[PDB]
From a paper:
The cholesterol-dependent cytolysin (CDC) genes are present in bacterial species that span terrestrial, vertebrate, and invertebrate niches, which suggests that they have evolved to function under widely different environmental conditions. The study of the pore-forming mechanism of the cholesterol-dependent cytolysins (CDCs) has established paradigms that have served as a basis for understanding the mechanisms of a wide array of pore-forming proteins (1), including the membrane attack complex/perforin-like (MACPF) proteins (2) and the stonefish family of venom toxins (SNTX) (3). These proteins all exhibit an analogous protein fold to domain 3 (D3) of the CDCs, which forms the β-barrel pore. The disruption of this interface allows the formation of the membrane spanning β-barrel pore in all CDCs.
Author numbering:
A (entry chain A): 2 to 475
B (entry chain B): 3 to 475
Write the structure that this text describes.
Amino acid sequence: GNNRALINDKLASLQYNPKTVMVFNGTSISNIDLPAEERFDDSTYIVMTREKCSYEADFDIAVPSAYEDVTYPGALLVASNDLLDGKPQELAVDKDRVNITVDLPGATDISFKVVPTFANVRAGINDILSKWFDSHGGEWSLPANFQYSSSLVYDENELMLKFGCDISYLKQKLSIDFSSTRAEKKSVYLIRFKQIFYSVSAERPAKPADIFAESTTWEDLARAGISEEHPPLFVKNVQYGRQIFLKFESKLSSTELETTIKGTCSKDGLKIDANASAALKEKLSQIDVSIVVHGGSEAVYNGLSLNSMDDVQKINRIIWDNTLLSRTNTAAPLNYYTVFLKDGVSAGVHGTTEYVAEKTERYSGGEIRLEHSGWYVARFTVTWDEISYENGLKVIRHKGWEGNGKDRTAPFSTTIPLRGNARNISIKTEGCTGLAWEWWRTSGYKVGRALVPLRTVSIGGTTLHQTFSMTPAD
Amino acid sequence: NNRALINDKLASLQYNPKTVMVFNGTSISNIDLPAEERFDDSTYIVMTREKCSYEADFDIAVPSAYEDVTYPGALLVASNDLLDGKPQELAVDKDRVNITVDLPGATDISFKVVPTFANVRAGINDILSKWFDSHGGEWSLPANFQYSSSLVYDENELMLKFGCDISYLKQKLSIDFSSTRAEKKSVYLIRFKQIFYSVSAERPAKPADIFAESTTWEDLARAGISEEHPPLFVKNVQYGRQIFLKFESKLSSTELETTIKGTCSKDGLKIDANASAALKEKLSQIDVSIVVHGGSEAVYNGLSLNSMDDVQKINRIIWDNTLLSRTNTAAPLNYYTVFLKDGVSAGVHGTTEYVAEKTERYSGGEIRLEHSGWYVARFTVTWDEISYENGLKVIRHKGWEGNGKDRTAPFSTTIPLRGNARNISIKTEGCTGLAWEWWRTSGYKVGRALVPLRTVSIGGTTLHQTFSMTPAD
């Protein structure tokens, strides 16, 4: 009982700041040279603007695939930045008994006391699990009820921070490599469906040293890594369940990828249907789908397409599968929560990471049709502004139709084609009355109109009754 | 004999036409301009700045006080100072030119006299009293009408969009943009212009014909003539009336433009008597100045837009004297020049840089949660909160304090959010009492906008959970 009393004193005297001992490290971008850029796709004008952003959120710690046997409820760890990177460092010493509590929904919480070891905690969990589904028939079922998350992802750090997942696992299965992806002109959108089936918690002993066997000494802890820079931690809680990831990769722009997916996919699945779209499909055809399913079932799929109605229904089925939880069909560990052993303060961290958001806007070209059928001489004036980005400067050039002011007779009809960089259209029509005190009469003067696909201005009538109609009548 | 020699001096007087007069635009430094934010009260305001430039043809206005030297058939020394409203008179003695008055509907009636401010003015008005006498009409329609409007950043943007005389407007409207920008005021300008008639002059083929036989080449070098400063001929002058309306405000550029564009048109100002209280308080922050340049001049300061009598007064100023009459003198507006030697246009293209200021306003809002059903529910509300700090758009994920907590009916509460909240998601769950399916999701809405009021109502029973959201979407 003398060794524990030394561990308590050395623990209580171990001075460290809970907030700064582990720290998320995100991407930094350090450069303001993000000028707008432009191009044309025939009459279509495509402007791409870039903005530096950072995303801030509580960092959820995934249970790594390769360290499940070290992150079980009641495990001990040495705090280390390498825990945030998916490599938690076991604190391997002998321990005394701890209360482990399984929280299953609709059931009263059953607990059991054992020395926290992977084999002991696992057996205890699987026993309580046996009694629960050995009491719902053989072993039974849980319908899909998912938390939903979606986002474009710039790099591995935005991914980890928004989705709280094990990058290492997801890199294996979904084949995520952002150097290859940006080297091509590809963007990535990611959806996650997440369902927690049950949780398992562990109570930290009032006096912390009580977690150790009586034989363990302070000197064993220091040899394993413990110190003020690496205080000990206690796995307070692990969640178990099922997780589905959908990765959408495209050469389309970020903005067009996000818009296409946001309109065809949601928390309800994929509602993509036939007879109300046609260029949507040539977009969709450019989107490669990958899927990984983890917990319950285990599956990965690659090479699916959203044109096919039967790929869409295969996806929705994967998503809305009921899971038959049993001894032969387990749940996967998803996230775990650590507390500092010294006092029981959380070791959850905040994370920040910077990224470059790219916004693409497409502005379609258009036409102005002028038609004169009136019994008089008429002139048309058409002007507009043309937008250009030349280095980091929005250049605005006033322009004019070559025919402005010229006299026009009898049946006259022309089309003025405009590209998507034209704004601020002004149109004026005048008809010569033939009478000296009112020689030119203005039948229409529309300024500041927008470029629409087809604008038609018709004048007709006679010298003293001049008609004007514009379509659309903006 | 001086004609032989003056004519050959303009042999190949070395100058490029396009280079001898060049528009001097504003240039902006390329120091970074970061987004700026502030809050009024729960309303969130983001201000962004973009460096721009505007290019167009530069219409040269007739400067007040240089009308004596920019009449048709007058002679000028070329020079960057002309673009700035100080054209340099070339005062030598001149022969006779054919000057042609162009009245709308009239035959082009010409006369040949010695180019002089007094000569052409008398010659034009003599032609005017003749066209008026041969008409029972007191009034005729102008040859042309033009309506323009824009925000203005500095004097150069103003000169280029409007082809105005900067100096006349600076004095009459007391414009100064270094003071205006300091006080955080924005400026919207509108112009109405009527050209009643033009008055052109034909340039003789043998250019020297324009000088009396007594003037020599040395009388001209003494007037300032060079290769750097070739001679100009005022070929055509437009006469009429012009009015400027200057709208000045502590409102933002975006909001000033949007308010004026919606209450002004080529027909004048329209304010609906049934105006929203929001719209009326913005109009109450707009001060209106007016400069009228015609046969009569006038300047108005401190007009307002807050009553229909204020709007009437302004529309009456705009449309007063917009028809040519015997009693309603036209005034010179714009003038066009050729190089005396060969006759090509001395007209220049212009470019100027400015900083455009785009302001967006994001009102606050509430989410009301209501629970009426016969079961235990929990709500989950999250959003992102936007900030601009340094040059960084910062997005902080936030959650309602009450998330995940069991709620028993009746429950009601309100979550207030300010306008930097975006991307709202709301999840409502109900406990069925069945171990199979303990928790059932009854509504899950993500990526929603912050509206002034979003109501989420849940009711029903454990196995029939009802859900309504208003606005649905």
